[PDB]
A paper describes a structure:
Unlike most of other RTKs that are monomeric in the unliganded state, the IR family receptors form a stable dimer by inter-protomer interactions and disulfide bonds, independent of ligand binding. Insulin or IGF1 binding induces a large structural change and stabilizes the active conformations of IR and IGF1R, which activate signaling cascades.
Here, we first determined the cryo-EM structure of IGF1 bound full-length IGF1R mutant (four glycine residues inserted in the αCT; IGF1R-P673G4) that has been shown to exhibit reduced negative cooperativity. Through the mutagenesis and binding experiments, we also showed that increasing the flexibility of disulfide-linked αCTs by inserting four glycine residues (IGF1R-P673G4) reduces the negative cooperativity of IGF1R that allows the binding of the second IGF1 to IGF1R. In addition, the 3D reconstruction of the particles from the minor class of IGF1R- P673G4/IGF1 dataset resulted in a T-shaped symmetric conformation, which is resemblance of the T-shaped IR with two insulins bound in the top part. Notably, such conformation does not exist in the dataset of IGF1R-WT/IGF1 complex. The subsequent 3D refinement of this minor class resolved a cryo-EM map at overall ~4 Å resolution. In this T-shaped IGF1R-P673G4/IGF1 complex, two IGF1s are bound in the top part of the ‘T’, in a similar fashion as the binding of single IGF1 to IGF1R-WT. The structural differences between IGF1R-WT/IGF1 and IGF1R-P673G4/IGF1 suggest that the disulfide-linked αCTs is the origin of negative cooperativity in the binding of IGF1 to IGF1R, and is critical for stabilizing the one IGF1 bound Γ-shaped asymmetric conformation of IGF1R. Notably, the distance between the two membrane-proximal domains of IGF1R-WT/IGF1 that is mediated by the unliganded L1 domain is considerably shorter than that of IGF1R-P673G4/IGF1, which may favor efficient autophosphorylation of the intracellular kinase domains.
Author numbering:
A (entry chain C), B (entry chain D): 4 to 38, 41 to 63
C (entry chain B): 1 to 153, 162 to 189, 193 to 260, 265 to 294, 301 to 510, 515 to 635, 679 to 710, 750 to 901
D (entry chain A): 1 to 153, 162 to 189, 193 to 260, 265 to 294, 300 to 510, 515 to 635, 679 to 710, 750 to 901
Write the structure that this text describes.
Amino acid sequence: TLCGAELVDALQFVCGDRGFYFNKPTGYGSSSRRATGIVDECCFRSCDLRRLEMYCAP
Amino acid sequence: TLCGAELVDALQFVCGDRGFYFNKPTGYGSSSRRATGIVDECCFRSCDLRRLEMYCAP
Amino acid sequence: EICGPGIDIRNDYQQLKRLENCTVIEGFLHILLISKAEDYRSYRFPKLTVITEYLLLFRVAGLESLGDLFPNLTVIRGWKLFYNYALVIFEMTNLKDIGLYNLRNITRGAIRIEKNADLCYLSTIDWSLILDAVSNNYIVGNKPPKECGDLCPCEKTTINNEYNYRCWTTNRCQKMCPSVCACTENNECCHPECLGSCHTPDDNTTCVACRHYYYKGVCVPACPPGTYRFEGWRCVDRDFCANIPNAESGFVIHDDECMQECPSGFIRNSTQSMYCIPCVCGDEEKKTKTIDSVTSAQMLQGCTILKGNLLINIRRGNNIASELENFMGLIEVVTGYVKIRHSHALVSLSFLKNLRLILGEEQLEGNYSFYVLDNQNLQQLWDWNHRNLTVRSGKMYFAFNPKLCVSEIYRMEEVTGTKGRQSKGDINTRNNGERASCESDVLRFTSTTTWKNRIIITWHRYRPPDYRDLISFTVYYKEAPFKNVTEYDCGSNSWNMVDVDLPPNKEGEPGILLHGLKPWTQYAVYVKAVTLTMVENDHIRGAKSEILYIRTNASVPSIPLDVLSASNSSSQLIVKWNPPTLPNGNLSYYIVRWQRQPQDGYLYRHNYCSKTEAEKQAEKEEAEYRKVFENFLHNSIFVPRPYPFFESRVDNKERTVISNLRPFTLYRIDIHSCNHEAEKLGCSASNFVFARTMPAEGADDIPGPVTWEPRPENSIFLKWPEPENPNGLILMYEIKYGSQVEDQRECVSRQEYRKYGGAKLNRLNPGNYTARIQATSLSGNGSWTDPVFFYVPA
Amino acid sequence: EICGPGIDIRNDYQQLKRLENCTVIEGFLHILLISKAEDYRSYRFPKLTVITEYLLLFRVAGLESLGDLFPNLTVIRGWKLFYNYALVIFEMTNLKDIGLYNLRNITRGAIRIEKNADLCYLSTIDWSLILDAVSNNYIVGNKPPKECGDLCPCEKTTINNEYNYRCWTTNRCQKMCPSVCACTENNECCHPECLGSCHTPDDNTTCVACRHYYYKGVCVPACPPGTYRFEGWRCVDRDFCANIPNAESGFVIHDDECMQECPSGFIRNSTQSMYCIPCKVCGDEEKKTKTIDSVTSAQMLQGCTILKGNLLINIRRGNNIASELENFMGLIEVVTGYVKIRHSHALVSLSFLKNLRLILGEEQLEGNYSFYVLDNQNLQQLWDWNHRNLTVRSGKMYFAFNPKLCVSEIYRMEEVTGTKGRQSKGDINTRNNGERASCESDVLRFTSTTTWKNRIIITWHRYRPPDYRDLISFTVYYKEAPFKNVTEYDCGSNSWNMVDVDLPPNKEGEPGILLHGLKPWTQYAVYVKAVTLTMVENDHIRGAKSEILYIRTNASVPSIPLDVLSASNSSSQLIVKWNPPTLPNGNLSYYIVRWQRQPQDGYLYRHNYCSKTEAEKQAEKEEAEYRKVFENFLHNSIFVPRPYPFFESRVDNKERTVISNLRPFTLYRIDIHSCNHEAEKLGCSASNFVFARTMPAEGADDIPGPVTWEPRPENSIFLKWPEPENPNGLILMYEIKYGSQVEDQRECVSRQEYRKYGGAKLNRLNPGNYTARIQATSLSGNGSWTDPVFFYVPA
């Protein structure tokens, strides 16, 4: 399993110039979603490259 | 409440020359009864004279 | 210009161009994960000067400082915090120094910069003036200060330990204001409604970004009724926050303020949806809302009924219970359990003053509708007489809270109505509040007696309901010269355990003796009655004694130090002392005595004129074993029926004058230091010192004619008196003698003076004798008198 | 005569009359609560000598000692104990001393005398000679030894601290036997089958009461088949224990012994009810719970197969009584109810319940608990091994406060018994369950190590838990252990030495550690523990420990020798001794002891005179957890899914060595130097030079030739002679004389004028005859008065 700094490092290693995707909505206020999402998906279970690279901007 | 040294000191003070009753059976082996009986009756609840003096030989 | 509703920068340096054309931005400002491959062009952004909420910097590659991109940023409001933090700088590379010189004040949050192997210039810059709560900061894991060694080209002020300069970088120091009072560019106050920097002082329309509000370029503590607040920073009309692209997935005006949503009972008015009329949160999917910090706490602001779970983990913070009660003390019923884990920043759970009912529809494992754990400071729950609370169903748990007193949890358990649903397995007492006890049985001190170094204390015989429970008494004493004493266990001036045995079968008053005690000290002493609780059987609150301050008897002080002697003038011998190291009582007066001492016998008779845990547990087990054996015995046995000395008294000052001063005299002086209990004790020891006064003889010549007497064939006999006050004593009287002038040295000794008067040299050459006489003493050659014309005939 | 089945004395001293006519009391003997009003009449009972079960004494008023009433009691069998105790004396009044002189042995129990403010004579008497397991004794609360101060008119044996007389009372010591070999009256060993005392030795029918059995006045290790055992003391015939007034509320024979009942599956035979036939199940249905505290409460359960109740074990103290326990409880296979265990500090392992296989748990504790432990200070290892099966039909399971029980053990037992879905961290925790002792953990391998005289550097392989972000802090412990038996539990009183080392930073090599200020040449025991946090409980995580490593540091130069003394025994024979240094710093190899003859004093030559505390540890753990949770939140939030030369010598065997060239009165430079085994590279010790002046010697201290004279112008006495080369150090004041007819007035012929010319000179001296009284004096004083030398001026 990988947790902490490794994550972003591994993340960088899988994206490079591709960039990181963001669902940029405009919205207003705290109604738009909130602040598990990653550490559930990577820190508590080993995440394969198939499950991880999806966070990369196209 | 009273437990231990008070008990006998109370018990003697109740009986004096009367003596303590014993159900002396002959029997054989451990089958005859067993080895709570007093501290349940006195140490965990206050015991008055009416409840306590009964342990006295007639 | 104002940019909304929040800007994020990711993977593209050119995205900085989105900040080109707005002086203010409302919304979060993220700059995260920027590759250094892009040519750093020093993208100056003087327009951006204030950000409504937190600023997040995460792994920007190739960025060198912060002045190069944010030169005019002056205050961050931090309306919408980011995990207790308003400006976070995480994993910085190439960022050697921070260039946010224009920054002046951060309202809400606390700073946090860490894990940056190349960044420095932090201990130089002080935050307390800029940040209103410095104690919540977190700056570690950066360049160590020793390995950094910063320097500044900004005055010296004390950062909690010492004065030093405050320096943003190698180029520029921070800006502050004189003690006159906001601040302008040049050391002068501004309008009260201003914030940070100013264009011209004492104006409402020239503030760079003004505090407490803003509107149409002017500032006011309460903007007009035609305007409504916006994120605590702007005021806008209806036409602004009515057609605003809300996309909440418009705004409603409550109390002349337009926000996203109305409290329960208030709903959008029909055909007037931008207004509220009188006539609730909680996600149904996650059903559990972990509360880590004021971000997760703020997202619940204005929630009435929570349909889910509460899981409070507040790991650290300053007195943030204020914020917690502000944005969370509005819930009245939680459908599920309320777990509290590791929340070490909650000295009391009182911030939920509006909670009354815990439905607990779905519980934890084993039907738990309440749960605490490891809370190192939950010192007092809020279950007071002023508060009511009900648990509809489910058990309740407690563990590891070292300050939460057991009486408190029992009170809350009986108040909430879960008495039948508990067990000693859940709510224990071996760890709950083991470090803090609120009340106990009163231990009254029966009597006490004191000595100079001995104390005896007797207390009334404590008797637990079962007298055999070892009432083992442990006395703690501390040399406390004050009243503020903490009653927790030792060693370095905290307390000192001394165990005293149980009262033996001599049932009077148990007592304790203390010896080896420093006299005249305020000891804080008190006894704790440790007893075994036997089987669980809850309760048993032990027995505590009132902390007693006792002052021991006085004793003799030590000999004074700084004891010296000196001479300045006749009949004036100064002698000095100092208060003793160990007075043992308030000093009252000094008796100082001096003795004139006799001369030397050899120099005169011979004339020379020519409880560690393991054993505590063993003791507890022993005491339990005794009880169990006796109970078994009672059960098995019984069965139911069917040259004198002069004194003086001087205490005001150290240097004390002494009379009777003759030059070059040896005097011994004794000093005593009497305390303010000298009436019966007496005084101190004797501090004695010998001293020789100044040498002085002047013209210590013969007090009369130096008469010459002849003899048979010429000899020089003399007769004279003796000088009464020489420089100590005559040693070598430098008379002379010669054929025509007295040139060959002569010692007309005081031996022959006391015997006959003078010397004798039979058959000496006759002639005239012009006497070169010097008055000498033991100090050496003294006063050379004039040629004395006491001559042998020529 | 044998008294049975047991005698109680209460509230009447005269009831002692019931003990008049029997010599053995099979059963228990109580004497309790006797009023002192009845006078003491010296109720000698020499008939009573042995009692099968315990003897209880409780508050006998007016009783003075025990010899008066029990003179011949020689052995108490203790078949049926009394709360681990075979003879108990409680709350004694008027009892100054114990007079049980005839007592020799007690088989089962342990003694217990307590709370008797008038009684003494206990530390005098040794119990190991009478009872076999001393450690289970209990003697507290009696007369303090200082306030007692006993004396005795019977050897002296060290009772764990020192020897002293073993004296029963002021009248008589206890009796032992000679080491040659039972024991008779007079220091002789009896028949082996005997027990205690014997009338005549090597006899099977003259034993007072013989061990291992008894029958018809004779003794035998295994009584004949026609007889059956009775309380492990008697063998009776068929008729005795058949028509016996049992009143169980007869006896059945198994294995040629008759007891009360039969094991499950064995039942009284039809028409042969005194016999058994194959084809227990005890447990009271009313109490439903059988508190277990001692072998008195455990023996009643012996011979039981199925327990229809609750087992509640708490045996607060004892020696290895698990051996006893497995005999009485190693026969139950199923308990209907739960099994609680409290305060049972005497159970290092509960293996004695081997035959237990199923716990029905029909009715449970609160919260449906069918198993429960608590506060067991030594339950170091449960019995759930691969050799045994165990099932819990229903109910949860609990654990707490056991400071030695390892978490791996309880996890193994819970997965074996089949309760995995029924547990939680709330029940079976790990903060207090065995935090004082762990057996298995992650292996830490030492990568490398280097050493110095006082410096050590250790490197270990990087340890990465599943979440490397965990505070993997390393605590190295080191002790000066010159042995191999080392305990690996926490410092302070020389137990260990805590040192914390930082985490491996983002320089990901081998996280090392430096130790300095270390004593050279020592077998340090060093090992590192990997302290880590766990965030959510999630159980497991066994930490990581390293093998306890023994490292011998490099040595240094030894210190100076001790007992540095030099003495003279003969010419060219100077003895000088030393001693091994206080800190040798390495194994010694040899000594380089060298001496230098020293020049004499220059002023005599130039001027010849012939004329972590828990709080900060928890704070550190909390800080690490805070860092981890914050950056986890950060990663979660930002991302988003897409849609005078010197002479040496080498002597080391003995301390004192001999030096040659002992010129009289010559200071030397005997420098001792203790070289260690590494002398070739290390060197010797510090300098230990000694200035040893040799013995006096004069020999021919007189003039080495004729003492000649010389006349001059008007009489002056000149002298001529050579100078001795071996004086007593150096000539000081040469005692010759001179006179008119006999030399009477001393003539101090100094060596100064001798060196210049040869003698003195006194112009115009009175002539006459001279008889020289010459003494060869040196700096030591007047030397040897030589004979009158007849050198003279003419008369």
